[PDB]
Symmetry: C2
Subunit: 396 residues, 2 copies
């Protein structure tokens, strides 16, 4: 039965990580995968996370299955983060949240729900986008189309091209938005641009799908949700796939949520029963540990305070590295203006390095970035910055 199966196409980005670990050069620098490093180049467990895990160790008395949609307090805390406490969406009970194995898990659940229960045939993703979006939607049986996004000359959101290319989207297509910290560009719509999109989206009959993996990494928890909330103020229906991998440093515990919004309580409860059915035929119910950690933190004043500060620390370290990167580039003799890097949001920006320049960086300098020239700024440190920038200057 398996004799004739052809190998899956190598994933160049996971193939990168694989190449990194095999590299015996001591000064090797990892700017590939989207992970937060501290100033010592390590990927720590958050202190608030350790404290919550101690609490669970000392207090959990069972591992009895969660409901299909996971821990209720997790759902409640997630909707407050998303929509704001006292939001009319919450008061009107228009939203239902399933705890999922990561944001990736949430994307798959949404895709499966849409494919099996609606007329949706296609999803619009930005060009460029995180490559996994196409993969997940295609695997669910959905076509993926691309909309213009990035003005690479001005390092800006090409809002005209975006709007113009989205005009080819039909009523009933899904349009995917990144809530903040667009991967890979670091370029997000302004509040005004988000409000214009929310208006266009309603007129045109698009179903908004928000991918919200970096809440707290652009400006702050509430500020980062402004775009979503502008849509939520305008739309009867919306889906949000959110993740706590990055803002809790909980990557491997697979902690995310798929949130469904409909016009009213009866509708959302009805539609959510089909989302629960999709989950049931997948992994049945989600993993408790990472999500209990999140719920324990978000629902305790003292832990939440510590965690919010840890998140602030992470965001500010990245902002410092953005500035340090452009400064060291200038000092190291780089020809180019890299100032656009300072304005961009989250872990990533496009460096503007070619695929060949990145290959050179890896082979000659042990500096690992992805083929698009996207770099993980959260992988830069005061200790690695000088060798990093000397390497970039050498390849320009």
């Amino acid at each position: 039965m398996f004799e004739n199966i052809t190998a899956a196409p190598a994933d160049p980005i996971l193939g990168l990580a694989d190449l990194f670990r095999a590299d015996e050069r001591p000064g090797k620098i990892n700017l590939g995968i989207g992970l937060y490093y501290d100033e010592t180049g390590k990927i720590p467990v958050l202190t608030s996370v350790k404290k919550a895990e101690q609490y669970l160790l000392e207090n959990e008395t069972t591992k009895l299955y969660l409901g299909i949609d996971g821990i209720p307090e997790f759902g409640r805390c997630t909707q407050e983060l998303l929509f704001g406490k006292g939001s009319a969406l919450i008061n009107d009970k228009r939203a239902r949240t399933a705890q999922t194995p990561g944001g990736s898990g949430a994307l798959r659940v949404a895709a499966d729900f849409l494919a099996k229960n609606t007329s949706v045939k296609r999803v619009w993703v930005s060009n460029p986008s995180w490559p996994n979006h196409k993969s997940v939607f295609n695997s669910a049986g959905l076509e993926v189309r691309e909309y213009a996004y990035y003005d690479a000359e001005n390092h800006t959101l090409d809002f005209d091209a975006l709007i113009n290319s989205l005009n080819e989207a039909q009523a009933g297509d899904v349009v995917l938005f990144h809530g903040c910290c667009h991967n890979p560009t670091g370029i997000d719509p302004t509040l005004e641009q988000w409000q214009t999109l929310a208006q266009l989206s309603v007129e045109k009959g698009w179903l908004p799908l928000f991918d919200f993996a970096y809440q707290g990494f652009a400006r702050g928890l509430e500020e980062d949700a402004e775009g979503l909330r502008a849509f939520a103020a305008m739309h009867k229906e919306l889906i949000v796939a959110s993740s706590y991998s990055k803002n809790f440093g909980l990557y491997n515990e697979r902690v995310g949520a798929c949130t469904l919004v409909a016009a009213d309580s009866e509708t959302v409860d009805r539609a959510f029963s089909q989302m629960k059915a999709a989950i049931r035929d997948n992994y049945s119910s989600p993993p408790a540990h990472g999500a209990s950690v999140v719920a324990t933190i978000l629902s305790n004043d003292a832990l939440r305070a510590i965690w919010e500060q840890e998140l602030t620390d992470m965001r500010q370290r990245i902002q410092r590295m953005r500035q340090l990167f452009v400064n060291t580039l200038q000092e190291k003799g780089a020809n180019r203006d890299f100032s656009f890097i300072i304005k961009q949001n989250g872990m990533f920006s496009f460096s503007g390095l070619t695929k060949e320049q990145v290959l050179r960086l890896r082979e000659e300098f042990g500096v690992y970035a992805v083929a698009s020239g996207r770099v993980n700024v959260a992988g830069m440190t005061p200790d690695n910055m000088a060798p990093l920038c000397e390497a970039i200057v050498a390849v320009l």
Copy 2:
């Protein structure tokens, strides 16, 4: 987009649990869902599990993502449990294991792999079977057909009907077997019956899919794997979806494995790359906590000793309740022979109660079982046995 979605059909078994928690009667007895209760009617965390969780708390320094297939030591330990240490399958590197979110997760991954990469159009399941089998396979786009299994008059495996009905299976169909502790009958093939099946399966060109959720609950870890190992000695190719939910009391942590076996190393590595692709487009990588607990236990002599004894304790408590159940039934005036219960394996047997008798038990006596009359023996205790049996006698 969601206005016209119809509600998912209520799941009577999850609807049962929901009904149970709303029941304010004090002496209520839960014999529904497959969970291990101790003699005080609680569903405890295993001591070996708590010790492993303490160790992880004190020693983990990162939550960096696992590989798509999870923790390598988890895979190694899983294959040894499945095939036996020193197995030729392991020595020849014919097997690859992906850590998955539970046995349910493993079933979905297998189904997705099969549907997307092979000519498989149908899966044979026993009649009766765990209802989720049909659901999972159908959701992946696979037809499900049923084979005869149960001789309800003699409370036995109807081996003739099974073999006769499986004759309608074509070369290239999947046949699903429960490794031990058949859900719901508690009736497993003997070693001889398993060997005959392994032979038939080869001749007929079936792809065996083992669902192995209760290793250790029939006779013991090695004894329970005898059927699988008889197949593995005969087949070039096989898939195993296994779970640690029940034998580690780790239900909500979603800890399982999908193991792929092929004729040789090159083949299995090739086919497994497509299984990894299916996982990538689902939940991306599996949750670390529950699987690290399992790997930490299985790979430490002291913890493994404690855990194996805890598992032995669970198996023996169930065997005691089987005997106590039939004894108390006789003492309480039951007309019927219930002796077949003593011989059956795992958490469940068919009580022979009608759907109406079970409805009566619930409404009049607060005793919760499923419509098929299947009861969770692991939900019986010395304290609840008398009221339970008085209730059954009343409804006969």
